[PDB]
Amino acid sequence: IVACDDPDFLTSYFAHSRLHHLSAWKANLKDKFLNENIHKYTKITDKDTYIIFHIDFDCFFATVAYLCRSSSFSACDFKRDPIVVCHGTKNSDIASCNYVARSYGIKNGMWVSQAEKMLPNGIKLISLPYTFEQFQLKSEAFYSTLKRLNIFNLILPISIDEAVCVRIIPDNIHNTNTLNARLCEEIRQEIFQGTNGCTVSIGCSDSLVLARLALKMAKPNGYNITFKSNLSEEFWSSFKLDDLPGVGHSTLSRLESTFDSPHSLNDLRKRYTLDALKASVGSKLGMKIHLALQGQDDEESLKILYDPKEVLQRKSLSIDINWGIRFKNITQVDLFIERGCQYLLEKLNEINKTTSQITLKLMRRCKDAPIEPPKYMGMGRCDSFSRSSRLGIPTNEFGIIATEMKSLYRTLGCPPMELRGLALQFNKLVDVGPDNNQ
DNA sequence: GGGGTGTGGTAG
DNA sequence: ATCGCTACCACACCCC
Numbered sequence A: 001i002v003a004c005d006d007p008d009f010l011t012s013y014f015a016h017s018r019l020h021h022l023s024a025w026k027a028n029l030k031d032k033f034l035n036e037n038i039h040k041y042t043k044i045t046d047k048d049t050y051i052i053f054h055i056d057f058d059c060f061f062a063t064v065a066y067l068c069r070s071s072s073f074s075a076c077d078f079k080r081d082p083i084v085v086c087h088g089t090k091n092s093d094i095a096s097c098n099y100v101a102r103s104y105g106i107k108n109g110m111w112v113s114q115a116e117k118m119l120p121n122g123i124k125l126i127s128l129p130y131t132f133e134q135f136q137l138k139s140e141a142f143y144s145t146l147k148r149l150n151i152f153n154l155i156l157p158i159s160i161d162e163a164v165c166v167r168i169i170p171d172n173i174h175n176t177n178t179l180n181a182r183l184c185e186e187i188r189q190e191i192f193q194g195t196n197g198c199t200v201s202i203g204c205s206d207s208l209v210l211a212r213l214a215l216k217m218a219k220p221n222g223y224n225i226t227f228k229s230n231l232s233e234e235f236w237s238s239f240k241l242d243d244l245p246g247v248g249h250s251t252l253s254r255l256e257s258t259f260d261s262p263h264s265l266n267d268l269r270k271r272y273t274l275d276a277l278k279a280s281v282g283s284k285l286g287m288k289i290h291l292a293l294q295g296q297d298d299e300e301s302l303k304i305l306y307d308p309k310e311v312l313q314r315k316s317l318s319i320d321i322n323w324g325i326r327f328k329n330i331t332q333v334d335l336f337i338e339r340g341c342q343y344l345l346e347k348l349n350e351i352n353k354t355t356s357q358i359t360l361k362l363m364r365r366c367k368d369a370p371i372e373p374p375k376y377m378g379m380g381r382c383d384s385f386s387r388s389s390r391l392g393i394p395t396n397e398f399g400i401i402a403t404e405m406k407s408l409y410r411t412l413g414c415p416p417m418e419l420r421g422l423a424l425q426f427n428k429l430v431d432v433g434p435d436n437n438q
Numbered sequence B: 001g002g003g004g005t006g007t008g009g010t011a012g
Numbered sequence C: 001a002t003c004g005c006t007a008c009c010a011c012a013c014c015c016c
C-alpha cells in the first residue's frame, strides 16, 4: 500500500485509476490522429453530403474483463450473470456493468453497495477485476478494423471504445437503408471477429446527434438507422432527457423543473419553446437542445467534422488527484506538488511545448463534513478553491513552475489536514520553434 | 469593441 | 478497503 506522501503515490494511483486511463487513452488517440494526418486534409467540406456511423463497444470493460477473466471466474456466464468491473466490495465504482446487471437497474458509476441492493435474493453479483492492458489491445483491434474496412472517409476517435465514422455519399450514388444495414452488419461482424468476441452497436444517421441517439436505441449488440427523414413520435418517445449529449443530471433537473417533469424526449419536444428552454438551461445549451430535438447538430458540434485537427488539438494539460489525499503538514503537501509538476513537465516536454499560465485548484473538507468520508480515501463533501497565475515568459522550467504552484497553494489558505484534493493545470500551451534567439 | 478571472457542467 | 480523471465550452462578472 502506497500513501500520498510516498514518492510512488502518483505512479500507483494512475496505474489503478480507470478514469486516468480513459483520459490518457483518449489523449493518445487524438495525438495519433494528428500525427497520421499532418500532411493529409481529410476534413469534411461544405460540398460533402455524409452519413455518420457512431460505433461503440457494448459494456466495454465488462465485456473485455469477462473475455479475459482469470481461471477463478472460468464458470462465469456473460449471458446469465449480472457482472460488474470494480476494485472493491462496497463504496467502489462500477466502471462497467453488463446488460444482465442493467436489467435490475444497475448503471455504470454506481457503487457496488448500491447495486447489490437492486438484486433479488439468490441473485449474486459477479465482480471482475480490471484488465487495463487488454482494454487497450481490444481498442487497437477496433480502430485497426475500422481503417482496414476502407469504407469511411474520416474516422474520429471519441473514446477508447467509441468512434465517429464518416462516409461521404456522392450525388452520383443512391444511398439506401439496405446498403447502410449491410455496412452495419459488416462492421459489427468484422469487429466481433477482430476483437475475439466483443460486440459493438452502431447508430447510423445524417447528423451526429441522431447517430448518438440511434446508438442508444441500437444497444445492446445491434444497429439502428434513423435519418432525419425517418423521425417519428415513436423514436422520440424512446429516450430519456439525459440521453441527449450534453444533458447530464444538472441540466436534467432544470428541464424537469421548467417543463413539468417530461419523461421522454417526446414530452419535452411537445412542451418546450426555444425561449423558455434558453431561460431554463442557458442560451447556447438551450439552442443545442432545440436543434437536437429537430435531429440537427449545432455549430459547435459540427466543428469536429470540418476542422478535426483544431478540435482534437490539446489546449491544456493537467492532473487531478481527489482520492487518497491525506497530508499532515505543508512540507508533505509541497513535495506532492513538486512530484505533480515533474510529472506534468514530462508530459509537456513530450509534446514540445511551454506553458504561459498555470492554475492550482484544491478541494477542502467542508466544515461540517466528517474527517473520514463514506468512501474510503474519498474526498467527501468539499468546498473548491482555485487560483491562476500568468507567467512572465512561457516556460518549461521546474523551478519557476513548482515555486509558483506552491505559492498558489499558500494563497488559498487550506490547512494541510483539511486538504482532500488537488489539481495542477497548465492552462495555456505555447509552441517551441526553431528560432529561440531572445 | 477588446481583454481578464473563477466556476459549472459534461463526458467517457 | 479502494484507486472520485481531466479537456474544454459556456457562463457570470470584473476591467478598459
Ligand SMILES: Nc1ccn([C@H]2C[C@H](O)[C@@H](COP(=O)(O)OP(=O)(O)OP(=O)(O)O)O2)c(=O)n1
Residues within 6 Å of the ligand: A018, A019, A022, A056, A057, A058, A059, A060, A061, A062, A094, A095, A096, A097, A108, A109, A161, A162, A219, B012
Ligand atoms: N461512469 C463511468 C462510465 C464509463 N467508464 C468506463 C468503463 C466503460 O466500459 C467505458 C466506456 O464507457 P461507455 O459510456 O461507452 O459505457 P459502456 O461501454 O460500459 O456501456 P454502453 O456503451 O453499452 O452503455 O468507460 C467508467 O469507468 N465509469
Ligand SMILES: [Ca+2]
Residues within 6 Å of the ligand: A056, A057, A058, A059, A060, A161, A162
Ligand atoms: Ca460503450
Ligand SMILES: [Ca+2]
Residues within 6 Å of the ligand: A056, A057, A159, A161, A162, B012
Ligand atoms: Ca463509449
Ligand SMILES: [Ca+2]
Residues within 6 Å of the ligand: A242, A243, A244, A245, A246, A247, A248
Ligand atoms: Ca447525456
